[PDB]
């Protein structure tokens, strides 16, 4: 079968920068019948279905911004974004329409770079509803921060608690290019009621000292 080799695996670009992505086929995709290259580029934003950007190597699909440019012939093809916009973050991949099976490239993840943004931290004690049932989850939100690197420390009565902590990250925002993360310390009502002070500490490059949020049960 035809093998589509895509590169690089990922790119981090500042808004306005020109991005180049490669797509190389193990066989020429040039059809001798119409002298057209049977390769297309698609864009897949987080949680969405892939959308057609360019087909026949260089023909933009109706409605596609002209900053998306396709070129190349035979085996070597390229997708260019002349000036990356914050909304352009997504997975980009190629597919050959030359012969079955119509194989895909493994894709290129495009992420955005930007200025610093300190996280807004909020801590939430378990709800009366949950405690009613015997559960006790302590939730901490770290919202709209950049860069992505960060670290949350949970403390119970002034001592670090590591186990039982699960985090979740949002996809990079297509508007402000920031990230948000949730941190959840899952306890039981009985366990929760044997301690007094609960603390969520966020360490981020935007500050040498941690952002601290606490409450007393």
């Amino acid at each position: 079968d035809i093998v589509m080799t895509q590169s690089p695996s990922s790119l981090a670009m500042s808004v306005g920068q020109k991005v180049t992505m490669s797509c190389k086929s193990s066989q020429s995709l040039l059809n001798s019948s119409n002298q057209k290259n049977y390769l297309a580029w698609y864009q897949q934003k987080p949680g969405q279905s892939p959308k057609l950007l360019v087909y026949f190597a260089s023909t933009r699909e109706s409605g596609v911004p002209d900053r998306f440019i396709g070129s190349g012939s035979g085996t070597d093809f390229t997708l260019t974004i002349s000036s990356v916009q914050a909304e352009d973050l997504a997975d980009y991949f190629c597919q050959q329409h030359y012969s079955t099976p119509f194989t895909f490239g493994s894709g290129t993840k495009l992420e955005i770079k930007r200025a610093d943004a300190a996280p807004t931290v909020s801590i939430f004690p378990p709800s009366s509803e949950q405690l009613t049932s015997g559960g006790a989850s302590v939730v901490c939100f770290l919202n709209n921060f950049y860069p992505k690197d960060i670290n949350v420390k949970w403390k119970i009565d002034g001592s670090e608690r590591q186990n039982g902590v699960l985090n979740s990250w949002t996809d990079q925002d297509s508007k402000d290019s920031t990230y948000s993360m949730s941190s959840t310390l899952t306890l039981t009502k009985d366990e929760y009621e044997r301690h007094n002070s609960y603390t969520c500490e966020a360490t981020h490059k935007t500050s040498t000292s941690p952002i601290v949020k606490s409450f007393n049960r």
């Binding site: 895509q6 297309a40 895909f104 490239g105 004690p125 709800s127 989850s137 939100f141 990250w169 993360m181």
Partner: protein, 207 residues
């Protein structure tokens, strides 16, 4: 205009089979090849095969012969793919595609023996801006939908992807509003878990 309706997700027990559907609209069903593709979070997309609704002719990827069977129903303008004897390797999102141009919504296939379970929805109230929360804990399988004020409160909202443990997902969503607007203006998270036919509206109330 073109649309390819695919069920959100399907739960299939290991060793069992499943029939995925793809209802087409906005174009003549019999005037285009219908493709099917498999996508796993791990690696690159895979072309499963194609079928032409006007003749029933099919072309398969050698790798999927004996795993996938493509059929069509021209009377309902629907394309189907039968996946046989699923393993964990068969867990993925399956797309139907009109030609190479238009991609369907994609069906999430979860291969598991785990039991479908409705989630518990808990309000997250605070201990110039205030942040509220919604905790959706212990549901299966994916997915769930979460809106604020029936969807009218869209700005300043962050819904975090769920986490998985012992066959149960847990998800949360935060909403940040001007502090002088709450709690005077009520804020409510609307949660729906189709699998367990669960519909919950949780109003966030001050502690």
């Amino acid at each position: 205009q073109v649309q390819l309706q695919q069920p959100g997700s399907v739960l299939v027990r290991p060793g069992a089979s499943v029939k995925l559907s793809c209802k087409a609209s906005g174009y003549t069903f019999t005037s285009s090849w219908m493709h099917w593709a498999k996508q796993r979070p791990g690696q690159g997309l895979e072309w499963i095969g194609e079928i032409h609704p006007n003749s029933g002719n099919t072309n398969y990827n050698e790798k999927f012969k004996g795993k996938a069977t493509l059929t069509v129903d021209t009377s309902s303008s629907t394309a189907y793919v039968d996946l046989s004897s699923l393993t964990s390797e068969d867990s993925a999102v399956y797309y139907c595609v009109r030609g190479f141009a238009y991609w369907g919504q994609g069906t999430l296939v979860t291969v598991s023996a785990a039991k479908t379970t409705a989630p518990s929805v808990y309000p997250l109230a605070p201990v110039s801006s205030v942040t509220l929360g919604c905790l959706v804990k212990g549901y299966f399988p994916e997915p769930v939908t979460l809106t604020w004020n029936s969807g009218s409160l869209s700005s300043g909202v962050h819904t975090f992807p769920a986490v998985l443990q012992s066959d149960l997902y847990t998800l949360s969503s935060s909403v940040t509003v001007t502090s002088s607007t709450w709690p005077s203006q009520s804020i409510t998270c609307n949660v729906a878990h189709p699998a367990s036919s669960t519909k919950v509206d949780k109003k966030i109330e001050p502690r």
